[PDB]
Ligand binder design. Structure first.
Ligand SMILES: Nc1nc2c(ncn2[C@@H]2O[C@@H]3COP(=O)(O)O[C@H]4[C@@H](O)[C@H](n5cnc6c(=O)[nH]c(N)nc65)O[C@@H]4COP(=O)(O)O[C@H]3[C@H]2O)c(=O)[nH]1
Ligand SMILES: Nc1nc2c(ncn2[C@@H]2O[C@@H]3COP(=O)(O)O[C@H]4[C@@H](O)[C@H](n5cnc6c(=O)[nH]c(N)nc65)O[C@@H]4COP(=O)(O)O[C@H]3[C@H]2O)c(=O)[nH]1
Lengths: 548, 548
């Protein structure tokens, strides 16, 4: 029928190569994109076998009907038979007649064409890949325009920082794929509650940004409380299991002309942190003098609380083993160090409660200098026993405060002299986020320490081009695959490939990989099969006391 | 007919949303990917108008048949009418019956899905986007494996660095799109001449890398000379105009176990530079003592040549104006400074001949200290005339040598005191490549200088995610759109969009843009329309003498 013309136009409109072949070989259809890719017109290629023209290699034109893919892209090369290869990502599917497998269809994507997609490159640079909302790049730009513009600048604006109180919980509990959905659902929820001419963004992690251009002070708080209540009223469930979904809002009434971008962002960040300190699931409006004193007070509260904890010897160190998945691998003992604080009452405080508050008020350099010294102090005390299990590696986490700290190296040279621990045994751990936050400083730090004999590790690493662009400049020795991927790796196929990608690129960049959150032997065997170097988790070993 | 089942399966296999509608509105077809995207089954959406269901916005379902796109993707949003937007890149095409425009077809791509493509992310990180060959990441990794491996390491390997002698010429003359084709053609040409188990890469720019694992010394040179002759025998033509296409090969006979990656790459780079110094279109085999003395000799030759040129006052400075495209924009005079050397004979030497040789032997810090001092010296001499055209901006190019040079700031503080030129007037210029080469150092440099009052500019900038990732960390004030894009912008549609992308993202990152190589008023008007801030080129003003 002439309905073929409609179908032919549709397939011609599509950018990807479309090859339709018979169950044995012979070509049925070729869209112009496939005709171009294969160097063969359908006029002169119809009925001729696929393999006896060009070649799809790394024979293959049978596993589609048998057992392979079913949606997952696979890297292949179209050997033209004259003008060499065309790099493609294949998608195969069997052509049926109910049960009768009559042929096979292939969806080929030219990896060379990627470079040409401009409207897509322009989008990604102005939007978050996951949510589809504007990113910090575009958001700060939009905020700056709102603060300097001459036209449409009659009223006052409103800036909100909305932190999803349960994002880490969902993500760590259910896996990366779950927390991505929670963010994907919270996005549309805020999107529903926002008028036209309003900027909604994801400024990273669990944080979202709202810009309310030309909005009165009352309306601005009324809108905030509503979005806060609607996230609270949102019932989030992952594989039937429900989550107590809620958000911490920080509001800033902005003024165009007199207020600045740095002040605007720093003010919304103070007020947001305040809603969290004031118990989470709260809106907090910024005020320059009053309810700003709360930060001045909080500084003194935490200076005293952290210092008291150091003099009262309330901090203790725990050790969690990291083991090689390598076949018959010996090596020394490898452990990561985990900090534990015991409150005045005598209860173990998890790092959730004090580390962010000690990060905010700038007391982390202290905690790091305390941790490193006690890790060396404990290593000497352990060394006293001849029969004791020798430690080949000892991973210690460093804050952005320490990376910025110019006096740290001297302190470490002083620690190495005093305790005589070999540098090689030590492996400092910095998170990909912390490194990118102060990029120049992380590089300069990493190199100064690597030259001392120490080792480096890039904790909580998530694959993407940016991360692999950053990884080029960070001379780390190891890569800690973010546990959220390792959690539901055997459940969601995207996270299994996300682990698979970190491993290959990690190895290509000459880095040994570590999988975090390896809770089950089944997970461990999955990672061993993939070729992950080390496993850390509950199936390996739980944190046990290191210090006294 | 039942051929609909074949077509339905094909459209279901495709990842992108496919909406087929009537000339007025009503829906004809929806693939499951479009059904998912639009929140409507074809069972319950057939015949109902497109606009009276969901909405494609920033009405639109008519310009496809009229006049718009014809292949170019356009950013749009599918407003679900219940669960807000889905970010997409649209491709429209009219459905015909010869002349009878019966309907319309739309190809929608979910920008959220981009994040999920893993096989594609893994590829891009191990391959060059343009050529499709392995990148430096993968190539160095493959080389390292070849130097340490226990299995398949009986023989000796061969490393080649093949520099395309005319790549800059084609690119500058014809435009970016031409030099990309030349590289695309040279790729398949080397690909044709390479056996199975051989690594062919593009280690950037005009440079390609060849790894010949387990190959005898004779065969290795025989293969080199052949690939050299076949590139020479390649007839390259752009829009009918032919180019004298040829390559400079540098060969290194590698040994697995005793030889190292750093040595391997540095040796192939020395021998390659040598084929260029020995007149280009040559293969050059590396030898540790003999024909290595040529580098020791070349150091002395250029130490003498550059120093002689400084004491003989043979170097002179030229000024090229950069003008704003801004409507009724005044400002001071903006100029870029260009270095000119006059050889012993009295002939103007173009920077092509001495800058790479003075970069290699490390004499650039010298030339930069000479340039900056004479730019300030000339500015004072110009200032002596009251009626003289005042200079508001003066752009000066800095080498990676100067960026690495810790004593430069002191030198500049010394120059500012001595000549009394205000820092604000000065705009130092560093190329995106030079910055990324020593990333930590460029950031630390840029910031130290920006704090002095100076300005910064990122010369020869090419849009891509990596460049926009780097641009985040480089606090430059301006962006010099690579002239190769500006050259054939009104000819190839990809380069017009490549200019368009740099401008928008550049402005989003709060940077003023400059277009290089603005040869015609027509080009200038094109860039003005796009919203480019400044234009530099022959239509604006040619380089005239600045110094004496
Ligand atoms: N669900 C699950 N969890 C597992 C499993 N195995 C280990 N874990 C948990 O994973 C965390 C490992 O630490 P991290 O991700 O590097 O993340 C660290 C690090 O970000 C920070 N931290 C801890 N100590 C220090 C320190 O001394 N200095 C600095 N700067 N940060 C520290 O706090 C976090 C440690 O908190 P912990 O409560 O010790 O949390 C530990 C541990 O309780 C598992 O199989 N399943
Ligand atoms: N086809 C075409 N070309 C145009 C047009 N307008 C200007 N040009 C050319 O574009 C070049 C501009 O310099 P650049 O791209 O920054 O690139 C610079 C820079 O990379 C380098 N350079 C020059 N002076 C210095 C210097 O003093 N120090 C350092 N480190 N590098 C320098 O050498 C290059 C300058 O070489 P020049 O021969 O002066 O080349 C000049 C100029 O001749 C046009 O409309 N059409």
């Amino acid at each position: 029928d002439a309905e073929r013309e409609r179908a032919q136009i549709t397939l011609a409109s599509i950018g990807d190569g479309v090859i339709t072949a018979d169950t044995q070989g012979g070509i049925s259809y070729l869209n112009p994109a496939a005709e171009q890719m294969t160097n063969w017109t359908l006029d002169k290629a119809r009925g001729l076998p696929l393999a006896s023209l060009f070649r799809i290699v790394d024979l293959i034109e049978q596993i589609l009907s048998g057992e392979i893919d079913g949606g997952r892209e696979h890297s292949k090369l179209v050997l033209r038979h004259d003008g060499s290869s065309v790099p493609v990502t294949l998608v195969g599917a069997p052509i049926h007649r109910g049960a009768e497998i009559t042929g096979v269809v292939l969806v080929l994507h030219d990896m060379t064409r990627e470079r040409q997609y401009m409207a897509r490159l322009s989008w990604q640079a102005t939007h978050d890949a996951l949510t589809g909302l504007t990113n910090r790049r575009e958001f700060e730009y939009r905020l700056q325009i709102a603060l300097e513009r001459l036209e449409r600048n009659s009223g006052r604006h409103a800036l909100m920082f909305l932190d999803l109180d349960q994002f880490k919980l969902v993500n760590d509990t259910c896996g990366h794929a779950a927390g991505d959905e929670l963010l994907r659902q919270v996005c549309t929820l805020l999107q529903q509650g926002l008028r036209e001419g309003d900027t909604l963004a994801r400024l990273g992690g669990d944080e979202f940004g709202i810009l309310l251009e030309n909005c009165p002070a009352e309306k601005a708080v009324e809108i905030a409380d509503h979005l806060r209540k609607t996230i609270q009223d949102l019932h989030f469930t992952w594989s039937g299991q429900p989550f107590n979904c809620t958000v911490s809002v920080g509001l800033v009434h902005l003024l165009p002309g007199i207020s600045t971008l740095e002040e605007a962002l720093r003010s919304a960040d103070m007020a947001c942190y305040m809603a969290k300190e004031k118990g989470r699931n709260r809106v907090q409006v910024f005020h320059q003098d009053d309810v700003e004193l709360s930060m001045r007070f909080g500084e003194m509260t935490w200076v005293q609380r952290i210092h008291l904890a150091l003099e009262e010897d309330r901090f203790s160190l725990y050790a969690q083993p990291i083991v090689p998945l390598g076949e018959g691998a010996e090596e020394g003992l490898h452990v990561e160090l985990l900090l534990r604080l015991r409150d005045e009452g005598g209860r173990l405080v998890p790092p959730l409660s004090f580390i962010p508050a000690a990060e905010r008020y700038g007391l982390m350099t202290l905690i790091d200098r305390w941790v490193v010294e006690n890790a060396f102090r404990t290593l000497v005390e352990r060394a006293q026993d001849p029969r004791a299990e020798p430690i080949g590696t000892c991973a210690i986490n460093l804050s952005g405060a320490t990376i910025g700290d110019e006096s740290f190296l001297q302190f470490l040279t002083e620690l190495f002299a005093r305790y005589r621990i070999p540098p090689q045994t030590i492996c400092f751990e910095v998170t990909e986020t912390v490194a990118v936050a102060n990029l120049a400083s992380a590089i300069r730090f990493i190199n100064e320490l690597k030259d001392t004999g120490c080792r480096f590790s890039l904790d909580d690493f998530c694959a993407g081009m940016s991360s692999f662009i950053y990884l080029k400049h960070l001379p780390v020795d190891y890569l800690k695959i973010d546990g959220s991927f390792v959690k539901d790796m055997l459940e969601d196929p995207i996270d299994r490939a996300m682990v698979q990608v970190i491993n290959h690129i990690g190895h290509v960049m000459g880095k040994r990989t570590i999988a975090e959150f390896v809770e089950t032997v089944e997970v461990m065997e999955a990672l061993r099969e993939i070729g992950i170097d080390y496993a850390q988790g509950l199936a390996i070993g739980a944190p046990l006391p290191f210090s006294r």
